[PDB]
Scaffold this motif. Structure first.
Motif, PDB file in Angstrom:
ATOM      1  N   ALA A  26       0.825  -1.207   0.000  1.00  0.00           N
ATOM      2  CA  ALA A  26       0.000   0.000   0.000  1.00  0.00           C
ATOM      3  C   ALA A  26       0.863   1.264   0.000  1.00  0.00           C
ATOM      4  N   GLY A  27       2.031   1.199   0.634  1.00  0.00           N
ATOM      5  CA  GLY A  27       2.963   2.313   0.638  1.00  0.00           C
ATOM      6  C   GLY A  27       3.537   2.558  -0.743  1.00  0.00           C
ATOM      7  N   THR A  28       4.049   1.505  -1.369  1.00  0.00           N
ATOM      8  CA  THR A  28       4.546   1.607  -2.733  1.00  0.00           C
ATOM      9  C   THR A  28       3.480   2.187  -3.667  1.00  0.00           C
ATOM     10  N   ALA A  29       2.258   1.673  -3.558  1.00  0.00           N
ATOM     11  CA  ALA A  29       1.170   2.130  -4.417  1.00  0.00           C
ATOM     12  C   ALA A  29       0.875   3.612  -4.211  1.00  0.00           C
ATOM     13  N   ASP A  30       0.923   4.073  -2.964  1.00  0.00           N
ATOM     14  CA  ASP A  30       0.589   5.457  -2.680  1.00  0.00           C
ATOM     15  C   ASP A  30       1.692   6.427  -3.110  1.00  0.00           C
ATOM     16  N   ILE A  31       2.954   6.003  -3.033  1.00  0.00           N
ATOM     17  CA  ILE A  31       4.051   6.791  -3.600  1.00  0.00           C
ATOM     18  C   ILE A  31       3.781   7.052  -5.084  1.00  0.00           C
ATOM     19  N   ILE A  32       3.502   5.970  -5.804  1.00  0.00           N
ATOM     20  CA  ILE A  32       3.304   6.046  -7.242  1.00  0.00           C
ATOM     21  C   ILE A  32       2.041   6.839  -7.573  1.00  0.00           C
ATOM     22  N   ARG A  33       0.990   6.642  -6.779  1.00  0.00           N
ATOM     23  CA  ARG A  33      -0.241   7.418  -6.922  1.00  0.00           C
ATOM     24  C   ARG A  33       0.044   8.920  -6.843  1.00  0.00           C
ATOM     25  N   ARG A  34       0.813   9.336  -5.838  1.00  0.00           N
ATOM     26  CA  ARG A  34       1.130  10.752  -5.677  1.00  0.00           C
ATOM     27  C   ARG A  34       1.950  11.281  -6.850  1.00  0.00           C
ATOM     28  N   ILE A  35       2.922  10.492  -7.306  1.00  0.00           N
ATOM     29  CA  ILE A  35       3.733  10.884  -8.454  1.00  0.00           C
ATOM     30  C   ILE A  35       2.843  11.128  -9.673  1.00  0.00           C
ATOM     31  N   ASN A  36       1.983  10.160  -9.971  1.00  0.00           N
ATOM     32  CA  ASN A  36       1.160  10.242 -11.164  1.00  0.00           C
ATOM     33  C   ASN A  36       0.090  11.324 -11.072  1.00  0.00           C
TER      34      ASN A  36
END
Length: 205
Positions: free
Chosen positions: A58-68
């Motif tokens: 979930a952490g990895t996903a949220d990093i990428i979510r914020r980037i995108n």
């Protein structure tokens, strides 16, 4: 000051196990310095449980979510990705998923890791708390199964491992010890992180 390279930027930080949701203690000082040095910055705290299991998807996903999400709003936004302990692993896995080409890769100007379970012996991004090489050639607890900072990311990564931090340095360290907990107040670490970020963002420090 305004960086011409990065008039808007986000310091995305992913915290360690047990830290309250909020900014990691690992980056508080440096981030106060970075945002004071360069205008247009915000600090984004990755949303996930940071639970002891170390299942950090979930952490990895949220990093990428914020980037995108940021790139959708401003194709010229810049990022620094910061991760401590479990958050460092979550960041490493984000790099593995993002790849080494494309918009997200280009927008991430630097990656700054402390106490990285995925620390990989020999990578030239690896420094100790004084910016030296005493922990360059050591492995973290998780690198064997979780993998490492990909080769194509190394040149814009700084992976800071305090000598004897048992999480990133299984040669000299022994589990979660004082060295793993040292980063928030280590002046070498905080200053290095601030200078690294400001320089990668196109400012002077």
């Amino acid at each position: 000051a305004t960086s011409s390279a990065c008039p808007q930027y986000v310091l995305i930080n992913t915290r360690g196990t047990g830290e309250p949701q909020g900014q990691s203690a690992g980056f508080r000082t440096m981030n106060s310095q970075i945002t004071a040095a360069l205008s247009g910055g915000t600090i984004y705290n990755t949303v996930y449980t940071a639970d002891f299991s170390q299942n950090s998807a979930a952490g990895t996903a949220d990093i990428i979510r914020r980037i995108n999400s940021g790139l959708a709003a401003n194709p010229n936004v810049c990022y620094i990705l910061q991760g401590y302990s479990q958050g460092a692993a979550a960041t490493v896995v984000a790099l593995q998923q993002l790849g080494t080409s494309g918009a997200a890769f280009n927008a991430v100007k630097g990656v700054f890791l402390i106490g990285n379970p995925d620390h990989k012996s020999g990578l030239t991004c690896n420094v100790d708390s004084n910016g030296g090489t005493t922990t360059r050639n050591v492995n973290g607890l998780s690198v064997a199964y979780q993998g490492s900072v990909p080769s194509g990311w190394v040149s814009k990564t700084l992976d800071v491992c305090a000598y004897g931090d048992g999480v990133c340095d299984t040669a000299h360290g022994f589990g979660i010890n004082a060295q793993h907990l040292s980063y928030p107040s280590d002046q070498g670490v905080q200053t290095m992180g601030y200078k690294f970020a400001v320089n990668k963002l196109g400012g002077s420090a």
